[PDB]
Amino acid sequence: SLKIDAVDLFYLSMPEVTDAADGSQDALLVRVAAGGHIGWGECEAAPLPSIAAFVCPKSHGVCRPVSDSVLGQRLDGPDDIARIAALVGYNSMDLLQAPHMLSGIEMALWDLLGRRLSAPAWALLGYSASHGKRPYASLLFGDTPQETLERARAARRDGFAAVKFGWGPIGRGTVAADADQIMAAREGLGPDGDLMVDVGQIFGEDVEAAAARLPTLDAAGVLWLEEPFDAGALAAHAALAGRGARVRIAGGEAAHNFHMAQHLMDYGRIGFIQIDCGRIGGLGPAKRVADAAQARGITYVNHTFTSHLALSASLQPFAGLEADRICEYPAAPQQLALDITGDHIRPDAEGLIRAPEAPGLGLQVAASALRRYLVETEIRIGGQLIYRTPQ
Amino acid sequence: SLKIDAVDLFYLSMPEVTDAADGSQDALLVRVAAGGHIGWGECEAAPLPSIAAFVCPKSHGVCRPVSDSVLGQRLDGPDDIARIAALVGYNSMDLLQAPHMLSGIEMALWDLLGRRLSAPAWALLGYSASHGKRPYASLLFGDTPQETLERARAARRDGFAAVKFGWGPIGRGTVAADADQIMAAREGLGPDGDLMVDVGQIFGEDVEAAAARLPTLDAAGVLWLEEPFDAGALAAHAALAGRGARVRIAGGEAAHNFHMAQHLMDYGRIGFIQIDCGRIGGLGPAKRVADAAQARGITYVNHTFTSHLALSASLQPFAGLEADRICEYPAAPQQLALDITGDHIRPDAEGLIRAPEAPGLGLQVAASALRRYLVETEIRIGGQLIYRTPQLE
Ligand code: NA
Ligand code: NA
Ligand code: NA
Numbered sequence: 001s002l003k004i005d006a007v008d009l010f011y012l013s014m015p016e017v018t019d020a021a022d023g024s025q026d027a028l029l030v031r032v033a034a035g036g037h038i039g040w041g042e043c044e045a046a047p048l049p050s051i052a053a054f055v056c057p058k059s060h061g062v063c064r065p066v067s068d069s070v071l072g073q074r075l076d077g078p079d080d081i082a083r084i085a086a087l088v089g090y091n092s093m094d095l096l097q098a099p100h101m102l103s104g105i106e107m108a109l110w111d112l113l114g115r116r117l118s119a120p121a122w123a124l125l126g127y128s129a130s131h132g133k134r135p136y137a138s139l140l141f142g143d144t145p146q147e148t149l150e151r152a153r154a155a156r157r158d159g160f161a162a163v164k165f166g167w168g169p170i171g172r173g174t175v176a177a178d179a180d181q182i183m184a185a186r187e188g189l190g191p192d193g194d195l196m197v198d199v200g201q202i203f204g205e206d207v208e209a210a211a212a213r214l215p216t217l218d219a220a221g222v223l224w225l226e227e228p229f230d231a232g233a234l235a236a237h238a239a240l241a242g243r244g245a246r247v248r249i250a251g252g253e254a255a256h257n258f259h260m261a262q263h264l265m266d267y268g269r270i271g272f273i274q275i276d277c278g279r280i281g282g283l284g285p286a287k288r289v290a291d292a293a294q295a296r297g298i299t300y301v302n303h304t305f306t307s308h309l310a311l312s313a314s315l316q317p318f319a320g321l322e323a324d325r326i327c328e329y330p331a332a333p334q335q336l337a338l339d340i341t342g343d344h345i346r347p348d349a350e351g352l353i354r355a356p357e358a359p360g361l362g363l364q365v366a367a368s369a370l371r372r373y374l375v376e377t378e379i380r381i382g383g384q385l386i387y388r389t390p391q
Numbered sequence: 392s393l394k395i396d397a398v399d400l401f402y403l404s405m406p407e408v409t410d411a412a413d414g415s416q417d418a419l420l421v422r423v424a425a426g427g428h429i430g431w432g433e434c435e436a437a438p439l440p441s442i443a444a445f446v447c448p449k450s451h452g453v454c455r456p457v458s459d460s461v462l463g464q465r466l467d468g469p470d471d472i473a474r475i476a477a478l479v480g481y482n483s484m485d486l487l488q489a490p491h492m493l494s495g496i497e498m499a500l501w502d503l504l505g506r507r508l509s510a511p512a513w514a515l516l517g518y519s520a521s522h523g524k525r526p527y528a529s530l531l532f533g534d535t536p537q538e539t540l541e542r543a544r545a546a547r548r549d550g551f552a553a554v555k556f557g558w559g560p561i562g563r564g565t566v567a568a569d570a571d572q573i574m575a576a577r578e579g580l581g582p583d584g585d586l587m588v589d590v591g592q593i594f595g596e597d598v599e600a601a602a603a604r605l606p607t608l609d610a611a612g613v614l615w616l617e618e619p620f621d622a623g624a625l626a627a628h629a630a631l632a633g634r635g636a637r638v639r640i641a642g643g644e645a646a647h648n649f650h651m652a653q654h655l656m657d658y659g660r661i662g663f664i665q666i667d668c669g670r671i672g673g674l675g676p677a678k679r680v681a682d683a684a685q686a687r688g689i690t691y692v693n694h695t696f697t698s699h700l701a702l703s704a705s706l707q708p709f710a711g712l713e714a715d716r717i718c719e720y721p722a723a724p725q726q727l728a729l730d731i732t733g734d735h736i737r738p739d740a741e742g743l744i745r746a747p748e749a750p751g752l753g754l755q756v757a758a759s760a761l762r763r764y765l766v767e768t769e770i771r772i773g774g775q776l777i778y779r780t781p782q783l784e
Contacts, residue, residue: 019452023485026450046454046486048770052443053488057766059417059437061410062591086595089621093592094414095437096647097444097488232650256487259623266626267658375448379439380769 002075002116006033007067007105008390009054011047011375014336024306024333026375027340029365030104031390032112034075039112040365042310042340044278045100048377053097055379055387063094066101078124081109085284099256099281106282107313107361114360121313121362122355125287127320132352134162134194135329138305141168145184152188155331161351162326163189166198166226171213179216186220194326196250198226205233210240217247223326224272226250237268248272252289253303255280261289265298274328276303277313286317290324300324306333307340312361315345319355327353339369393466393507397424398458398496399781400445402438403764405727411531412558412591415697415721415728418764420756421495422781423503425466430503431756433701433731435669436491439768444488446770446778454485457492469515472500476675490647490672497673498704498752505751512704512753513746516678518711523743526720527551527585529696532559536575543579546722550742553717554580557589557617562604570607577611585717587641589617596620598630605636615641615663622651628659639663643680644694646671652680656689665719667694668704677708685712695719698731703752706736710746718744727764733757758784 013026028047032039043050058064069087074080085106092098110121122130137160142148148165155163165185170178182197189195197217203210210228217225225247229236231254241249248271255261256279264270273293277286293300300321302314311330318324330337338344342364345353356362370391379387404417419438423430434441449455460478465471476497483489501512513521528546533539539556546554556576561569573588580586588608594601601619608616616638620627622645632640639662646652647670655661664684666677684691691712693705702721709715721728729735732754736744747753762783770778 013448017449017451019449021452023451023454026448046444046447046450046488048447048772049440049443049486049488052440053437056437056439057404057417058408058410060408060414061412063414063437090592093622093645095440096491097437097440100487232648232653234654257621257623259621259625263623263625263654263658267654376771376773378769378771380767381439382767 002034002037004032004034004071004073004075007054007070009051010370010390011051011377012336012369012373013375014334014373022334024330024337027306027336028104029340030108032105032108034112037112037116039108039110039115039360040309041104041106041108041111041282041313042278042307043100043104044276044310045103049097050101051377051387052379053095053101057381059094062091064091066092066098066105070105075109075113077113081106081284084109085281100279103278103280103282106284107277110283110316111360118359120355120357121283121316121360122319125283125316130319130355130357131322132348132350132354133315133327134325134351135327135347135353136160136162136164136194136196137331138164138166138328141165141170141181143169145180148181149184149188152185156189156193159351160331161192162194164196164198164226167200170197171199171202175212175216178213182216182220182222195220195222196224196226197222199228201227201230203228204230205236207236207239211243214243214245214247218245222247224248224250226274234263234267237264237270241269241271250274257281258285258288262292265292265296270298272299272301274301274303275317277317278310283313283316290317290321294321301326302328304328305330307337308344309341309361309363309365311345312356312363315355329353336369336373339366339372342366393425393428395423395425395462395464395466398461400442401761401781402442402766402768403727403760404766405725405764413531413696413725415724418698418727418731419495420731421499423496423499425503428503428507430499430501430506430751431700432495432497432499432502432673432704433669433698434491434495435667435697435701436494440488441492442768442778443770444483444486444492448772450485453482455482457483457489457496461496466500466504469504472497473675475500476672491670494669494671494673497675498668501674502751509750511746511748512674512707512751513710516674516707521710521746521748522713523739523741523745524706524718525552525716525742526718526744527553527555527587528722529555529557529719530722532556532561532572534560536571539572540575540579543576547580547584551722553585555587555589555719558591561588562590562593566603566607569604573607573611573613585614586611587615587617588613590619592618592621594619596624596627598627601631602634605634605638608638609636613638615639617641617665618644625654625658628655628661632660641665644670648672649676649679653683656684656687661689663690663692665692665694666705666708668708669701674704674707677705681708681712691715692717693719696721697724698728699735700732700752700754700756702736703747703754706746720744727760730757730760730763
């Protein structure tokens with residue numbers, strides 16, 4: 001038997017963290033050890049609250065620290081991962097942060113087992129192949145169409161054949177202003193590229209306002225319209241999706257369990273589900289969504305925006321879904337995110353990347369990142385250390 | 392005009408904490424100060440992760456510590472509470488723990504403004520009256536059926552006309568074991584009382600395992616079956632509710648935002664929505680649920696298993712809804728929960744309790760509880776304290 005005998009949590013940060021909407025400025029890295037075998041993962045989460053979730057004194061039987069369900073658990077194959085995740089689901093049910101902390105640990109378990117068994121995580125997850133995905137750069141709409149045009153042109157020059165434009169002025173004013181923006185993105189990208197549009201919930205619950213953009217989206221060959229409405233506005237999503245446009249509705253990036261994804265799929269009638277492994281509980285729950293998406297003719301996309309460790313994890317749950325051909329890619333992250341791995345995922349001759357055809361998550365975490373970016377962190381309860389920065 | 396000058400967080404705990412599913416064993420209390428005016432609230436949440444959510448270094452612009460959206464904020468009236476809560480919602484969006492930390496802060500704001508204005512929080516929430524609620528004794532299943540019977544018998548003899556048992560061994564093994572427990576509850580309670588059963592999400596997503604208890608629940612004349620499944624498993628809830636049993640489905644205590652409660656009402660086919668102000672973000676979101684429940688003709692009930700400060704807060708959102716007459720009452724809380732308030736909510740001559748007529752949440756937090764149960768807690772980043780246990784007195 002192998003048993004988990006250490007979980008080390010590394011709070012990493014860039015020296016200055018700004019108010020930019022940039023989640024690559026810090027990270028919580030997780031190193032799991034079981035009988036000398038090592039696995040790494042990354043939480044898509046506030047690092048200190050997640051650490052607190054891992055080590056806190058229990059409040060009661062269903063508000064236990066995450067560590068209670070992890071340390072000392074048998075880890076021999078995939079089925080143990082499911083058991084550990086279910087245990088955290090029950091015993092930490094009232095610890096709100098738990099899913100985010102779980103996510104980094106859980107992916108580390110797949111990494112650990114893959115490297116112990118010389119199998120890629122995607123193979124352990126049940127896929128027989130890892131197929132090429134076209135990476136998309138997540139871009140901001142310019143304040144003017146002219147700026148969007150140039151941004152799209154610059155992305156294409158940089159080698160992207162797929163881009164998503166989001167936020168900025170989009171949906172904040174007239175249908176005509178949105179038409180200029182979306183056409184500018186298409187014009188700059190070129191006619192053969194994949195173009196997606198994220199409106200960051202700007203239409204609220206106003207189905208007619210969102211629907212007024214569908215002809216423009218279809219004219220520009222836009223594949224998906226992400227987050228047209230408030231996250232809770234499921235009926236609005238379904239109504240918009242029922243309008244018959246070619247562009248499909250996308251959502252899911254903030255789901256922190258399978259149910260939230262399923263709500264969007266079944267009650268929201270979305271056509272692209274977008275899943276962050278660093279949020280949803282890791283690879284197992286993401287793979288659950290991918291299976292459910294397949295059943296429904298819904299396309300799975302990853303959501304990821306930090307390191308290549310997180311990117312590798314993000315690709316595992318749809319590695320074997322050949323037709324789900326687009327993936328999110330961290331096109332311009334902070335140096336921390338680049339530095340976290342020694343090696344990186346590289347495109348093939350067709351510009352496609354894939355969940356590494358290599359053991360576990362298929363990437364080496366760089367000890368040198370650990371040192372440079374390490375945040376000195378300690379928590380004491382009753383005078384006694386319950387968490388200190390590891391090495 | 393007033394600005395929030397201080398927010399002090401008190402991690403309280405019983406000397407021992409067990410594996411009972413009992414939220415009264417520890418607490419996170421929140422004292423907000425604005426220009427000498429005080430309000431108190433309570434988070435029904437894991438205290439250390441919540442404190443961490445309050446003080447953590449920011450990760451980026453929409454993952455800030457809760458304190459960034461609270462300290463220094465103007466608090467000139469009820470509208471600022473909504474404003475501050477929305478700010479936390481935006482600035483701490485990617486901080487999953489945030490709503491639990493916010494809950495205690497937000498209710499402390501209602502308490503503070505109510506105390507300053509000599510008005511009960513329910514009046515500030517827009518209710519014209521605080522109506523009597525009929526308390527059901529909220530208890531845990533004993534480890535054996537006879538223990539459960541004795542608990543139900545003791546509740547009836549204390550004057551409770553309604554009892555709920557939750558958790559303990561319920562749903563952990565066979566239907567037969569559950570039947571013994573539920574029948575013993577009915578036996579102890581007698582035939583006339585209302586009996587409710589809470590299974591603490593134990594069936595997970597197993598509709599058939601849950602469905603297998605429906606005859607037993609109906610034979611015992613159980614009013615509702617609470618939390619049969621994972622909080623987000625709405626289709627499972629709806630499937631269970633469609634099996635034709637008389638027992639109705641209840642839930643919502645795990646809602647940490649408004650839409651979790653709305654979705655449960657709209658997709659879960661529940662007959663009772665149950666809201667914890669200490670989890671959902673305080674009185675505002677809870678009142679928003681109560682309005683939505685009213686629009687739907689769904690009975691609203693508080694979820695409360697802890698102190699009378701929590702009780703008072705969770706009664707506020709339905710104080711003015713006269714027909715929503717039942718409330719949860721923690722009948723065997725840990726001493727910590729008892730000691731947290733110096734005064735308590737007491738029944739009138741008719742046996743009814745209510746959101747206090749007194750200002751704010753209408754109860755005083757006891758400084759003696761702060762002293763007895765305080766957990767000494769320190770967080771350092773870069774060698775520097777970012778949190779330490781507040782000074783006493
Ligand atoms: Na997005
Ligand atoms: Na069973
Ligand atoms: Na309950």
